[PDB]
Design brief:
The structure is a homotrimer.
Chain A lengths: L23 E7 L3 H12 L4 E6 L3 E7 L5 E8 L5 E4 L3 E6 H9 L7 E7 L5 E8 L4 E8 L9 H7 L2 H4 L4 E6 H12 L4 E7 L5 E6 L4 E7 L8 E2 L6 E7 L1 H9 L4 E6 L5 E7 L2 E7 L1
Antiparallel strand pairs in A: 1-5, 1-7, 2-3, 2-6, 3-4, 4-18, 7-8, 8-9, 10-14, 10-16, 11-12, 11-15, 12-13, 16-17, 17-18
Function (chains A, B, C): Plays a role in the inhibition of host innate immune system by acting as a negatively regulator of type I interferon production. Mechanistically, interacts with and prevents host IRF3 nuclear localization to inhibit its transcriptional activity.
Subunit structure (chains A, B, C): Interacts with host IRF3.
Family (chains A, B, C): Belongs to the asfivirus E301R family.
């Protein structure tokens, strides 16, 4: 094609009125395939067995829970922010994560494009196409998919991440993926639980654990503006919850996105919002 | 000496009429010692036990087979393309690969020169000298070698790589070491055998495997010019062979050279030619 | 603060007349925390169980021996070469290395400052504070320390590294940490002991081992000026000792400093002096 390395001249067309191929129930193309690799490293870290996929004319969404059933994951890729998107209607698919694990891990910088196709022809087949433009090499995966495991709680977890319900969480801040990784990797060296504490007002955010007669650790954020922290905790009121380290380390080590928004409420539930390009990743740990 | 790091001022003299030292049956010197490290990483990947060495007044050749006896390796370093070469006559040596494994792995960028000396004085000793010019440090290895294991098939494998016999292979193309590594690493994630298929004419090269009800994988090269593919397969004739992944991954992971020429024939035999600087590496898998 | 990354504007004030906080028996601050990480990688490589710490109004010193009891380590950080130092008197502390192992390993480039505080308030607590200036994040470790294990030989090992006793060692040279690592890693591939030999006069330094009928290895330094070698061995006199590889590889792999001074005497005792910035590291292997 056009090479200097191949110069990537891709157009972000978004949602199309009709597919290129007539039997396509879904046509997806994206110029950032590493998004899918990091997403499924996250699914691997969570030891998720099955990935629920919902395709609508506007976006595709991947649902999953971790093995310990504590964390819920909702990853939606917006069709208007990708290079090519069409979906005929609302249909669902089920993918075994172990089957596609190595396929997603095979994504490297030699692939400038990922294509996903589902056809009425093969109702139990999902096509994944990775394209190497340096040598015009097309790598096509034929993945056998099933009709979805119902999991009716997804109707309640998609409501839990609504913006009406989100702007009432009293404590929120932002970490880079590097910062979230460092905090919860260092914490995992000594503890499985960490206390998150914040006094009402302009006091620092505190993360700490205490072990008598050996080691106590306290990490304190003395400038709330530098982590985009906002708090609605009443003055002279103490916000204090304990959260598990394991699932947060799984998301942090996956490095799925650039920045990560952390939202906390008083009964211990956290929400992690990791938005990058076309991918909006939400983690609900209850 | 002359340093800015030491400025390497080495001369490629080639073959000499007589050695520097009088008792030298073989004097070899080369300014690219990493060639030998990658060559013996390959020998290690193949689990080769013994390396057969033939020294002639024109070149030195290393023979070996893999543990499964499927692959044959012929690596010859041309005396006219190295910095210093002399050999009195045609003689053979045998090296235990396990004995010299760590020695070759010790080669790094601090060594700007490898020297190999065999003397009539010590008929069962092979000298390997690595020189660090930053501190004038000379690292000398005294390796005990044996008289060679006969292996008479080498007379038939050196004939098999003749250019008369090579230009009749109907299917050939070229991969970079990175491309050959990616193809056969990704293949090894799901299969032990891959089908190589090519229809006569200007059709794409196809590599694929099929597993019912789980995963099928197909990688297709839509531009034969971009992989230097040439085919003599008759029009409307189908070339189709199955090849083992393991031994090819061993060569690809060794990253011995820059480019790799792949030659296929209809009964499944492959030949890999990897030529870099003074080293010509041939892999015959039958 | 002042950011372009945060521009580090730290002052090296040295020793202060009185602490900032009134109850501080020791106040230590340093703008090179990676020194402590490499120091405790060394302590980990030696499998040291307990670290003896002596704090004086002029400097802080860390003592330890390796598990095999062959090597002694004396690491002193000079208070006049750090950013902030005060100590009320001469007192001693004991630290369990396993307890603080992960804490020191958590030091990365996101921390521009390490602070160590001991208070009369908490006599069995040592505070370690790492500061991330990008987000004003303060990571405080509360380490439980004990009153020191007496180990009276430290009075004899601190005398052994006196400059009066050091300038009589007949053989000394200097390696970069990369060179010391390469020599004793390559040696560890084939041997547990290496012979160090030097003939009196301007002859090369020799390091070698010999194994009959398999492999002999000889590394020779043909330019003594390039490794800053000085010898007081009488002419036509042979200096020859055998030294263990393990403990030297532990120091070399730790990469604690830039250069390393090696001192040898005729009864096999070695001394390694590794001085970097505020840290002076001495290794005595008897």
């Amino acid at each position: 094609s056009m090479s200097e390395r191949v110069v990537p001249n891709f157009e972000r067309k978004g949602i199309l009125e009709k597919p290129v191929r007539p039997q396509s129930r879904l046509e997806f193309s994206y110029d950032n395939p590493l998004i899918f690799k990091n997403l499924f490293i996250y699914f691997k870290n969570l030891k998720s067995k099955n990935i629920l996929v919902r395709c609508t004319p506007t976006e595709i969404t991947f649902f999953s829970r971790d093995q310990s059933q504590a964390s819920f994951v909702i990853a939606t890729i917006d069709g208007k922010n990708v290079n090519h998107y069409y979906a005929s209607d609302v249909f669902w698919l089920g993918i075994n994560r172990e089957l596609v694990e190595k396929m997603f891990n095979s994504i490297d910088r030699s692939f400038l494009k990922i294509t996903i196709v589902h056809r009425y022809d093969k109702p139990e087949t999902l096509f994944f196409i990775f394209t190497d433009f340096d040598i015009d090499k097309e790598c096509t995966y034929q993945i056998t998919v099933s009709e979805p495991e119902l999991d009716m709680d997804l109707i309640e977890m998609e409501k839990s991440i609504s913006e009406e319900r989100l702007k009432n969480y009293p404590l929120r801040w932002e970490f880079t993926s590097k910062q979230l990784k460092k905090t919860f990797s260092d914490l995992s060296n000594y503890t499985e639980l960490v206390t998150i504490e914040k006094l009402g007002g302009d006091t620092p955010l505190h993360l700490y654990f205490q072990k008598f007669n050996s080691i106590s650790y306290h990490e304190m954020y003395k400038s709330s503006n530098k982590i985009n922290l906002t708090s609605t905790i009443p003055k002279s009121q103490v916000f204090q919850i304990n959260v598990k380290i394991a699932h947060i380390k799984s998301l942090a080590s996956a490095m799925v996105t650039d920045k990560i928004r952390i939202l906390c409420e008083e009964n211990g539930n956290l929400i992690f919002q990791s938005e990058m390009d076309a991918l909006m990743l939400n983690t609900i740990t209850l």
